[PDB]
Structures are given as structure tokens and as C-alpha cells.
Amino acid sequence: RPGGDTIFGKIIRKEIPAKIIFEDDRCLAFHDISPQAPTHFLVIPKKHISQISVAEDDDESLLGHLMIVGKKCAADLGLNKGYRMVVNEGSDGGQSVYHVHLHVLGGRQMHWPPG
Amino acid sequence: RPGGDTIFGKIIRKEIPAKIIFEDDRCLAFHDISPQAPTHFLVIPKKHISQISVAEDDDESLLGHLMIVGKKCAADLGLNKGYRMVVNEGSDGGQSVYHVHLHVLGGRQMHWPPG
Structure with missing residues (x-):
């Protein structure tokens, strides 16, 4: 499936509600449903990259576009x-959905270590 | 000063030792001196971008390249x-050096929230 067959794919396709901050032809920014800071949003590609460890070299521009x-x-x-x-990868990264997504958190002091 | 005037500029120019993992024309990966996980490294651009909030639109490819x-x-x-x-930005992000740098942490279970 396109946008993929995760909940983020559903969000991309407008099948489910999210609080959308920004959209373009490549990517989608929306507020995270389980925020971990006073502001917490995700920026996700429209193309279904399951996890950063399988991103291809020619995805480089896409990945920078999310940032x-x-x-x-x-x-x-x-x-x-x-x-x-x-960005979380795999089990040890605490990756929660198998669709690449860039968390952005603020509105409070972020602490160290970062988890 | 190619690389900037921060300690990271000194590392780029080989003026100071670091433990280098990878190098190309655009960026440098090296181990963090104050590791917060069993494996903890930084990937930094060779071009001096002080912080992600001043990155330009045409830095998109560079930023993806670090990922x-x-x-x-x-x-x-x-x-x-x-x-x-x-990536840490500014005061609330806990950004320690005014040169853009992507932390990469693993070898253990990372926790949520990410600080």
C-alpha cells in the first residue's frame, strides 16, 4: 500500500484524522497523538520508507527535506x-511505527541523555 | 576557516585528535568523547552550519547525507x-557546540521520552 500499510499511511491518505501542520507533494507534518513535550510533531515522507536503515542513497534529498x-x-x-x-530505528531505537518519521520536540527543556 | 571555528572545526582540520569512523568530501563521522550509550557517534558537515535553524533550503541534500x-x-x-x-537545537534542545551535528546512539535500549 501507498503511503504504506501503517497508521501513518492511513494519515497520509486522509483515512484517519490527524492535526496537520503542513503538507507538500513529498511529506506531511502533524502533531503527535502521544506528545512528549508541550510541542511534539512528526514529519514523515509520503513515500513508504519502513525504517531509516533501509533508506537508499537517492533518498538523501527527501530525508533532508524532512529536516x-x-x-x-x-x-x-x-x-x-x-x-x-x-529519528528512531528498530527495537533498540524505540521505533514505534514502521514508517520513517522525524520527531520534533520543544516548549520545554530537553534533557540528556536523549532516552 | 574551512570547518568553522568551533572545536568541531579543529577536528575537521586534524588539528585535534578524534576517533574517526568515516570521512568524505561533505561530512565527518567520529565518536563522541562523552558517550551516552555503548555506541555513540556524531556526523557533522564539513561546511559550518551553526545550528539547524539557520540551515538553508539548498542544504537539504547535505542534511540528508548526514543521516x-x-x-x-x-x-x-x-x-x-x-x-x-x-539533533539538538538551541537552549531547550541542549545544543552543546554551535556546529550542526547528528548524534547516533545504540548498543542499548533507548528510552521514551527522548529526554
Whole structure:
């Protein structure tokens, strides 16, 4: 399936509600349903990359696009003091959905270590 | 100063020792001196971007490249059970050096929230 056969694929296809911050032809930014900071959103590709460890070399621009979109969305949402960007891979990464997604968290002090 | 004037610029220019994992024309991977997991490295651009919030639109490919290099390095270092990627921005992000750097952490279960 297209956008893939995860819940994020459902969100991409508008089959399920999410709180959308930004969209383009490549990617989708939306507020995380289980926020871990006063602001917490995801930026996800429209193309179904299951996990960063299977991303291809020619996905490079796409992956950077998620970070560029993430930073623009953070600024638009008033995260002047900063934020943290997180991509989780696999079991040890605490990856929760098998669709690549870039977390963006702020509106509070993020701590170290990052989990 | 190619590489900037931060300690990371010194590492780029070989003026100071670091434990280098990978190098190309665009970026440098090396181990973090204060590791927060059994495996903990940084992938930094050679171009001096002070922080992700000042990255430009045309830095998109570069930014993805750090993630592609980060994932290749995590595989080469045997993180086959997974890992976490982190970029810190600003005060709330806990950003320690004003040069963009992608943390890559694994070799243990990463926890949620990510700080």
C-alpha cells in the first residue's frame, strides 16, 4: 500500500484524522497523538520508507527535506528557544511505527541523555 | 576557516585528535568523547552550519547525507538491533557546540521520552 500499510499511511491518505501542520507533494507534518513535550510533531515522507536503515542513497534529498520542513514548522509554531529532532530505528531505537518519521520536540527543556 | 571555528572545526582540520569512523568530501563521522550509550557517534558537515535553524533550503541534500552516512556507520558498527538519531537545537534542545551535528546512539535500549 501507498503511503504504506501503517497508521501513518492511513494519515497520509486522509483515512484517519490527524492535526496537520503542513503538507507538500513529498511529506506531511502533524502533531503527535502521544506528545512528549508541550510541542511534539512528526514529519514523515509520503513515500513508504519502513525504517531509516533501509533508506537508499537517492533518498538523501527527501530525508533532508524532512529536516528542512521540520525546522520551518518549529519556527512557525514559535519554538524560538529550540527543540530536539529524533529519528528512531528498530527495537533498540524505540521505533514505534514502521514508517520513517522525524520527531520534533520543544516548549520545554530537553534533557540528556536523549532516552 | 574551512570547518568553522568551533572545536568541531579543529577536528575537521586534524588539528585535534578524534576517533574517526568515516570521512568524505561533505561530512565527518567520529565518536563522541562523552558517550551516552555503548555506541555513540556524531556526523557533522564539513561546511559550518551553526545550528539547524539557520540551515538553508539548498542544504537539504547535505542534511540528508548526514543521516545516510549516520545509518551506514551504524550498520558498519554492528548496531543491527537499532539506534537513535538526535539533533539538538538551541537552549531547550541542549545544543552543546554551535556546529550542526547528528548524534547516533545504540548498543542499548533507548528510552521514551527522548529526554
